[PDB]
RNA sequence: AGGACCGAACCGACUAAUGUUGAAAAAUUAGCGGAUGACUUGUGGCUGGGGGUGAAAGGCCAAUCAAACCGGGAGAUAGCU
RNA sequence: ACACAGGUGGUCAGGUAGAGAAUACCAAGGCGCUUGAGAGAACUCGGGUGAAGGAACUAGGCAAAAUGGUGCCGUAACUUC
RNA sequence: AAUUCCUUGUCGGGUAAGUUCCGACCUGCACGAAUGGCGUAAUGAUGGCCAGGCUGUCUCCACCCGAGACUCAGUGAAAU
RNA sequence: CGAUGUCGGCUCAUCACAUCCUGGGGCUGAAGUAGGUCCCAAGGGUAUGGCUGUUCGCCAUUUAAAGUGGUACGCGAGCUGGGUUUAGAACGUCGUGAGACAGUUCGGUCCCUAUCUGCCGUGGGCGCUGGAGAACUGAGGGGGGCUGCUCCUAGUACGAGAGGACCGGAGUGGACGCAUCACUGGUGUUCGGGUUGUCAUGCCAAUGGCACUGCCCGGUAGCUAAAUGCGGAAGAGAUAAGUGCUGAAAGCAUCUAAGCACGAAACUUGCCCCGAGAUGAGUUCUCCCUGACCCUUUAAGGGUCCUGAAGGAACGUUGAAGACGACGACGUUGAUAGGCCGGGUGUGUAAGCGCAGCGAUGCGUUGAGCUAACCGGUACUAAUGAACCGUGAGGCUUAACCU
C-alpha cells in the first residue's frame, strides 16, 4: 500500500488539534446558502473518535432546542474549517455511547486538568 | 467464505482449543520434542514461539505474563533461565516441524516439532 | 427510514402529538421515507383544542430521522427521534405556524420554503 | 426415494471407474543412509536430508 | 480504441475544495509493451497483443520465452489482446503508457469477481426465505418449488438454483476518470471496480454514449 | 381434519 | 386453620422444536399444572371374558379390547379375488 | 430383542454464597459417555448479536424477546366482606 | 345467542379501513324455566377481542460460535 | 378403488394474447387538456393493509398500471394445517331410541438417506493424426430491455373565457440488477477492558478455570446492507397496423399488378457473459526430439540395445481460489506460509515502586501496558539432490511449385 499511502498523505491536514473523548469541542463548517458562504459552529461533546489517517472521523453530540443532535464529521474534509477544544473532560473510555440514555444532570462530565 | 482469516478450529470449541495448546506448549518446553498431528504442530508455532520472545527480556512483569499463558512455574522457570539465553541472538523461528508417518488408529498425518537447538 | 406503522413525533403547533405513517408516497413498492419526503399519516394523539382531531388522515413531511441524512463529504447528521410537520392533503402547505427543534437543509427548496423560515435552527 | 429397476453390473462397474487407487510415484533416497522414504518425510531410522534427527 | 492492463491497488478518497467525497479506485497501469501485431492478411482480424509487469526468468518456459524474444520485449506476467479500430496502427515492441487516457472522460473496467464459492439461492439469486417460525419444518432457506406437475414433467433449462457464485469475468461500464497520474503510472476511476486487491484489470474506454 | 379423500 | 399461597423432591402431561428405516413400538430439550391432600408410593391380596373394573373416554383388563389370550369344533363358510 | 439418552423402592447428606434437599463453584469419591483425523461450501439442527422501524408476520404475537429478589411507600371497579 | 338460515340483519363504540369483539333493537327459520331460566365475587395449561411493554415474527436479511453435511482411515445397513 | 393426497396461504415460477401500463396508428358527436372506439404489438413491468379459513368480495390509502386465462382449478418424496370431513363434548332441530344434520361451536400425530430422467454447479477419460506452452476467431447459446415527477420550449399553438399542449431538450427519483467495502453502520465466542459468585496457583498483591462468550462495554481484518459506484440506451437493417409517390388493367379514378419511399418497446443486430466435443473438433505465435541392430506373418508389422527432449505430473509452503477435484502464487538463482523487527488499529493511564489517606481508594512514573486475521521489511524455521510420466523428425493419394 505504498501507492495508496502516498496518495492519502498529500490530502491530510497538518494542523489538526489534539482532542479526546469527553472534550467539549467547537467545529466550524462551511455553509453554502445558494451562492453566499458562511460559517456556523457546532458546540458539543466528542463521544467517539475514529483514527484512520485520511479517513479519520469524530462524533459530536449536542442538545439543541430540546432535541439531541449527533453529527459525524470527517476530520480531513475541507468542509470542516477549524476545530477548537473549549474544555477538557475526564472519562475512563474511548466511546461514550452511554451518554445517549442520560440527560440533564446525569450527563455531566468531570474536568480533566491533566 | 473465510477470506483472509487465520487460525484453525480443529473441531473444538473456543475454550478447548485454548486449554489444549496451553498443555501442549508446556509439553514442548519441558521435553524439547513432541510428536503431534501435522495440523496441530503448525498451529502450535503461533503459541509457543511468542512465549520465547517474551522470555528474552527478564522482568517480573513478563514472568507474570508468561504465567498467565502457561499456568505452570516449571515452564516459566525454564523459559527465562534456559530458553531465553539460548535464543537470545535468534530472530524468530525457534521450532522445526519434521513430517513423519501416519497414525495407526485413524491414519492421521503425524509430525515431530522440536526446539531448534538440541 | 420511516415506513408504514412507524409512529413519529410532530414538529409543529398544529395540536397533534403522535402520528402514525400509513403510506409512503411517491412510487410503487416504495419502502422508506427519508428527510424531506411526503408521507400519508393518521393522528393517534392530540391536544384538546388544536387545529386537528385524533383520527384524521393527513399528509406530512419528514424533517428529522434517527437514521439521519448524509452530506456530500461523507458526514452524517442524526437525531434522537423521528419528527414530521403536518401538511394539508391537497395544497401541501404546513398547517401550523411554528416549527420546533432543528431541521436540515434537505428541506431547502421552493416546496418547503415556509418550514425553514419558521425553523429555530437549520443544520 | 428408492430405485424403480435394479441397476446392472454394467452401471455398477461404470460408477467404480473413478474409485481406483493410485500408487506413490517414486520414493526418495536419503543421501547418507540410502534408505527409501516418502518425500519430505523422515526415514524409518530417523534420518532426514543427510542428518539423523530423531535419535530413537 | 485500445485499452490497457493494470492492477487493482485498492480504494481511497479524493477531497475536492467544494467539499465532496469521491470514492476512487487506484489502478497501477504500468507500461504495456506490444508483443505481436495481427492483421487481416495473416490472422483474419486486426489486433495487437500486449504484456505488462515482469516475470521471473526461471519461471518463463521455453515456448513463452521464444515468443517474447521474437518481439524483443521483456517477459511480463501475461498476454492480452485488443481489437484495433480502422485507423490505428502499432508496431512490435512499442510500449504504451497511461497517457492513452489523458483526455478520456469515461472508461469500462473489467475484471474477475471475488469468489463466494457454492452459494445458496438466497445469496445467489436473491430469493425470499420462508417463515422462520409458525410451524416450518426444516425448510427455512430452501428454494421451495422448482416446477409444475405432469405438464411439463421436467425442470426447465436456466432454472435458478444453488451453485458456484462469483469468480467470473464481469465488466463495469462508464466509470468517471477522476485523475490520470502519468509520472507514477496511476489511474483513478470513480467507483468500485470488480475484483480483490492485486488482481488484473482491463481498462478500455467507454463504448456507450 | 381432512385425513382421507372423502 | 385451610381439598389456602409461592416453590424443589415426588406425581403429572398444556405449547413449540427435534426425532419419524428414532437414542426411544410414545422419548429428548426449553418453558408448563398440582405440590397436607378427593395426594403420592413400596410389599402382599381380591374381582375373569358377554365377565370384571370404570370421578364415564367405548377407557383399561400383560406393546392386543364395540367383547382378552391359548387350545379345540376346524380343512367353518366364501355366488369373491 | 442392544453394552438402548427410557423405567426402578429405601438409607447417608461436607464447604463458600443462598430461605433452601433450588442454583453456581468445589471437597470425599467417581468419571471424559468404545470410531477417529482434517476441512471451515450450500443446506439442516442448537445457540449469540443486530442499524431504522416495531405485530406491518400469521389462521392466531406460534416462537422468541421482555418481566423476575428483599425492605418500605402506595394501590381501582366489583365483592359471597 | 356455544342456539339466527336469510345475514357481513340494522344502529352505536373501537380502527385509516373490523364477515371477528363490546353495547343495544326483536322480524326468536328453530330460547325458556331442575335432559333447569337468568345473574354471579373468586378460580381456569378454557374460547373471542383490545391496549401498554417487548422483540428477527416481519420489511429483509447480515455476521458469528458449535453438532452434522464434504475429504481421508476402520467397521458397515435399509425400503425397493 | 392390490391409493393418482383435498380448498386456502407461503416459496418458485412458465406459457398464451382475447393488452392493464408503456410503444405505433385509423375514426371520433376529436378546438386544447382529458376521453370514447377499433387495428397492430407479448420486450419489460404489473400494490400495501383492515375483516374473513377463505379463493372471491367490500373498505382505507397508493400506483404508469394494480391484465385475463392455461400449466393435475401449476407447485405437500418443497413448507403450513386455518377450512364444509375420524375418534371427545355442547347448542338449535329431527327421531320413542340408537343416532343424524344438508346448521353452528371448542379440541384434534402431515413419513421417505434420490437409482433413472430433468435442472444447477464442478471434475476425470479419450478424441481433435508427431508432441507441447500460450493467445485468439466465433458457429451457437444465455443475460438485459420497466417507468414517474419537475423545469425549458411556452402560459406559446388552441380556446369567448376557464384552461392548456404535440414535436424536441435537461435534471432528479421509485422498483430491479451487477460489482464493491473508500465512507455510514452491523457482526466480529481468535483483541482490550469493567464486574458478580466460587475454586485454585502456600499466603498479600497479581493471575487462571467454571457459571450461555458467566454477565456486560468497546473493537482490527474479513464478510455484509440499510452504505455507494454503474446499468437499461443511442444508432443501424428488414417489417406490422398505417401513410404515401408514380401507375395501368378499367382513355378517368386507383398506395399495387411492374417500380419507389416512410413506418413500433415486437424480429435481426448494437451492450454484457459462456463458447472449437463447432466430431464441420478452426486460426496464429513460439518451443522440442535429426541413434544403431535383428526377425516374421513384408506391413500404418514385431522385437533388442542406447536414448528421455520441450513440457507435464507428483511432493512441499500456500492463496481475496475452493465441499473434493479444479484454478492461482512460490520451492533456496527464494518473501510462499509461520516467526521476528518497525508501524498502524483497538482498548484505555498495566505490573512493580513511591506518596496522600484510618480505610475503600486517589495521585506520579504513564496515553501506560497489552494488541487477531492489517501495512512495510527481514532467510530465523519449513518449502531437497533427485526420482516418475512424456521420445528419438511424424500415413496414403492427388494437385501446384522448386528439382
Ligand atoms: C411416521 C411414519 C408413518 O407415516 C405417517 O404417519 C404418515 C404421516 C401417514 O399420514 C397420516 C397423516 C395423513 C394426513 O396423511 C398424510 C392421514 O391422511 C393419514 C391417515 O395419516 C401416511 C402418509 C399414511 O398414508 C396415507 O394414508 C391415507 C389413509 C391414504 C393416503 N393416500 C394418499 C395414499 C396415504 O398417503 C399411512 C396410512 O400412515 C401410511 C401407512 C403405510 C402406514 O400406516 C405407515 C406404516 C405409517 O404408520 C408410517 C409410514 O409409519
Ligand atoms: Mg469429527
Ligand atoms: Mg415433524
Ligand atoms: Mg427450523
Ligand atoms: Mg415428454
Ligand atoms: Mg394447595
Ligand atoms: Mg393420566
Ligand atoms: Mg420437561
Ligand atoms: Mg406450587
Ligand atoms: Mg362416543
Ligand atoms: Mg394394552
Ligand atoms: Mg361377540
Ligand atoms: Mg364341523
Ligand atoms: Mg379355511
Ligand atoms: Mg456405549
Ligand atoms: Mg441405560
Ligand atoms: Mg424414583
Ligand atoms: Mg442441584
Ligand atoms: Mg458452520
Ligand atoms: Mg433491530
Ligand atoms: Mg436499536
Ligand atoms: Mg394483521
Ligand atoms: Mg398479511
Ligand atoms: Mg408463547
Ligand atoms: Mg389489529
Ligand atoms: Mg352482542
Ligand atoms: Mg335447551
Ligand atoms: Mg327444549
Ligand atoms: Mg317445569
Ligand atoms: Mg324439564
Ligand atoms: Mg469411508
Ligand atoms: Mg400400484
Ligand atoms: Mg392445484
Ligand atoms: Mg408434488
Ligand atoms: Mg362424536
Ligand atoms: Mg354431510
Ligand atoms: Mg414434510
Ligand atoms: Mg440474443
Ligand atoms: Mg462499528
Ligand atoms: Mg462483541
Ligand atoms: Mg487476593
Ligand atoms: Mg475446575
Ligand atoms: Mg465457558
Q: In testing the pocket of ligand 1, which one of F1, F2, F3 has its CB within 8 Å of the most ligand atoms?
A: F3
Per-domain boundaries in chain E: 1-209
* E41 C-beta less than 7 Å away from strand H: no
Residues of C in contact with A66 (CB under 8 A): 100-101
With CA atoms as reference, the chain A residue closest to E185 would be: A3
Burial of A35 (0-12, 13-18, 19+ CB in 10 A): exposed
CATH of the domain at B67: 3.90.1030.10
Q: At what angle do helices B38-54 and B60-67 cross, to 10 degrees?
A: 160
* B6 C-beta less than 7 Å away from strand H: no
Instruction: Give the closest-approach CA distance of E116 to chain B in angstroms.
Output: 6
- Judged by CB atoms within 8 Å, which residues 170-209 of E form the interface with A? 184, 186
What are the φ/ψ torsions at residue E98 (nearest 5 degrees)? -75, -5
Q: What is the dihedral of CA E96, E98, E104, E105, to 10 degrees?
A: 150
Residue B74 region, left (φ>0) first, then alpha (ψ -120 to 50), else beta?
alpha
* Method used to obtain the model: cryo-EM
The set of residues, in sequence order, having a beta carbon less than 8 Å from that of C119 and lying 6+ positions away, is: C99, C102, C103
- Judged by CB atoms within 8 Å, which residues 28-57 of E form the interface with A? 28
- B2 lies in some domain: no
Instruction: Give the closest-approach CA distance of A84 to chain E in angstroms.
Output: 20
**How far is E177 from E4, CA to CA, in rounded Å?**
14
| Residues A50 and A56: beta-carbon distance below 8 Å | yes
| Residues C98 and C114: beta-carbon distance below 8 Å | no
- B84 lies in some domain: yes
Residues of D in contact with B112 (CB under 8 A): 42, 53-54
The set of residues, in sequence order, having a beta carbon less than 8 Å from that of C41 and lying 6+ positions away, is: C8, C19, C20, C21, C22, C57, C58, C59, C60, C84, C86
Kindly indicate whether the domain formed by C1-123 is annotated with CATH number 2.40.150.20.
Answer: yes
Question: Looking at chain D, how many residues does it have?
Answer: 56
* Cβ-defined contact of A72 to C64 (cutoff 8 Å): no
Count of structural domains within chain B: 1
* B37 C-beta less than 7 Å away from strand H: yes
| CA-to-C1' span, B61 to J357 (A) | 28
**How far is E79 from E34, CA to CA, in rounded Å?**
10
**How far is E88 from E121, CA to CA, in rounded Å?**
46
Question: Looking at chain A, how many residues does it have?
Answer: 114
Instruction: State whether the Cα torsion B7-B8-B13-B16 is positive or negative.
Output: negative
**How far is E132 from E139, CA to CA, in rounded Å?**
9
B5 grid coordinates: 482469516
Element (H, E) at A50: strand A36-50
DSSP chain E: ---EEEEEEEEEEEEETTTEEEEEEEE----EEEEEEE-HHHHSS-EEEEE-S---TTTS-HHHHHHHHHHTPPP-S--EEEEPPTT----TT-EE-GGGGSS--EEEEEEEPPEEEEE-HHHHH-PPP--SSTT--S-SSS------STTT-SPPTT----EEEE-SEEEEEEEEEEEEEGGGTEEEEES--SS-TT-EEEEEE----
3-class state of residue F4 by DSSP: coil
What are the φ/ψ torsions at residue E114 (nearest 5 degrees)? -70, 150
- For residue B93, the enclosing domain spans 13-116
- B66 lies in some domain: yes
Nucleotide of closest approach to B109 (CA, C1'): H37
Amino acid at each position: 500500500s505504498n501507492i495508496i499511502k502516498q496518495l492519502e498523505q498529500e490530502q491530510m491536514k497538518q494542523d489538526v488539534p489534539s482532542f479526546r473523548p469527553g472534550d467539549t469541542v467547537e467545529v466550524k463548517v462551511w455553509v453554502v446558502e445558494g451562492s453566499k458562504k458562511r460559517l456556523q459552529a457546532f458546540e458539543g461533546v466528542v463521544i467517539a473518535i475514529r483514527n484512520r489517517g485520511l479517513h479519520s472521523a469524530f462524533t459530536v453530540r449536542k442538545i439543541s432546542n430540546g432535541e439531541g443532535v449527533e453529527r459525524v464529521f470527517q476530520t480531513h474534509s475541507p468542509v470542516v474549517d477549524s476545530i477548537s477544544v473549549k474544555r477538557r473532560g475526564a472519562v475512563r473510555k474511548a466511546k461514550l455511547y452511554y451518554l445517549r440514555e442520560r440527560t440533564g444532570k446525569a450527563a455531566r462530565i468531570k474536568e480533566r486538568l491533566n | 467464505m473465510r477470506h483472509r482469516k487465520s487460525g484453525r478450529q480443529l473441531n473444538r470449541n473456543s475454550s478447548h482449543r485454548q486449554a489444549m495448546f496451553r498443555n501442549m506448549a508446556g509439553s514442548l518446553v519441558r521435553h524439547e520434542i513432541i510428536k503431534t498431528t501435522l495440523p496441530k504442530a503448525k498451529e502450535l508455532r503461533r503459541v509457543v514461539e511468542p512465549l520465547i520472545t517474551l522470555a528474552k527480556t527478564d522482568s517480573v512483569a513478563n514472568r507474570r505474563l508468561a504465567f498467565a499463558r502457561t499456568r505452570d512455574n516449571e515452564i516459566v522457570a525454564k523459559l527465562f533461565n534456559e530458553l531465553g539465553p539460548r535464543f537470545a541472538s535468534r530472530a524468530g523461528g525457534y521450532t522445526r516441524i519434521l513430517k513423519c508417518g501416519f497414525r495407526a488408529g485413524d491414519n492421521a498425518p503425524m509430525a515431530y516439532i522440536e526446539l531448534v537447538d538440541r | 427510514m420511516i415506513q408504514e406503522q412507524t409512529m413519529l413525533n410532530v414538529a409543529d403547533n398544529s395540536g397533534a402529538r403522535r402520528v402514525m405513517c400509513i403510506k409512503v408516497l411517491g412510487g410503487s413498492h416504495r419502502r422508506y421515507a427519508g428527510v424531506g419526503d411526503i408521507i400519508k399519516i393518521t393522528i393517534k394523539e392530540a391536544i384538546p383544542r388544536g387545529k386537528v382531531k385524533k383520527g384524521d388522515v393527513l399528509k406530512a413531511v419528514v424533517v428529522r430521522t434517527k437514521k439521519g441524512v448524509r452530506r456530500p463529504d461523507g458526514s452524517v447528521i442524526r437525531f434522537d427521534g423521528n419528527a414530521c410537520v403536518l401538511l394539508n392533503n391537497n395544497s401541501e402547505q404546513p398547517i401550523g405556524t411554528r416549527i420546533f427543534g432543528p431541521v436540515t437543509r434537505e428541506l431547502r427548496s421552493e416546496k418547503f420554503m415556509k418550514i425553514i423560515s419558521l425553523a429555530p435552527e437549520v443544520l | 426415494a428408492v430405485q424403480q429397476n435394479k441397476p446392472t453390473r454394467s452401471k455398477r462397474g461404470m460408477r467404480r471407474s473413478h474409485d481406483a487407487l493410485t500408487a506413490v510415484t517414486s520414493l526418495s533416497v536419503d543421501k547418507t543412509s540410502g534408505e527409501k522414504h516418502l518425500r519430505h518425510h523422515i526415514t524409518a531410522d530417523g534420518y532426514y536430508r543427510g542428518r539423523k534427527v530423531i535419535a530413537k | 480504441m485500445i485499452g490497457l492492463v493494470g492492477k487493482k491497488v485498492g480504494m481511497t478518497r479524493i477531497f475536492t475544495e467544494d467539499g465532496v467525497s469521491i470514492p476512487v479506485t487506484v489502478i497501477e497501469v504500468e507500461a504495456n509493451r506490444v508483443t505481436q501485431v495481427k492483421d487481416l492478411a495473416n490472422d483474419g482480424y486486426r489486433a495487437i497483443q500486449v504484456t505488462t509487469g515482469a516475470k521471473k526468468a526461471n519461471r518463463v518456459t521455453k515456448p513463452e520465452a521464444g515468443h517474447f524474444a521474437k518481439a524483443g520485449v521483456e517477459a511480463g506476467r501475461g498476454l492480452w489482446e485488443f481489437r484495433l479500430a480502422e485507423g490505428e496502427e502499432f508496431t512490435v515492441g512499442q510500449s504504451i503508457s497511461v497517457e492513452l487516457f489523458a483526455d478520456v472522460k469515461k472508461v469500462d473496467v473489467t475484471g474477475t469477481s471475488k469468489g463466494k464459492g457454492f452459494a445458496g439461492t438466497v445469496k445467489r439469486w436473491n430469493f425470499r426465505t420462508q417463515d422462520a417460525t409458525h410451524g416450518n419444518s426444516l425448510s427455512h432457506r430452501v428454494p421451495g418449488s422448482i416446477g409444475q406437475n405432469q405438464t411439463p414433467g421436467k425442470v426447465f433449462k436456466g432454472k435458478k438454483m444453488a451453485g458456484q457464485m462469483g469468480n467470473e469475468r464481469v465488466t463495469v461500464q462508464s466509470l468517471d476518470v477522476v485523475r490520470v497520474d502519468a509520472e507514477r503510472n496511476l489511474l483513478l476511476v470513480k467507483g468500485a471496480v470488480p475484483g480483490a486487491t492485486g488482481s488484473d484489470l482491463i481498462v478500455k474506454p467507454a463504448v456507450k454514449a | 381434519m381432512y385425513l382421507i379423500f372423502m
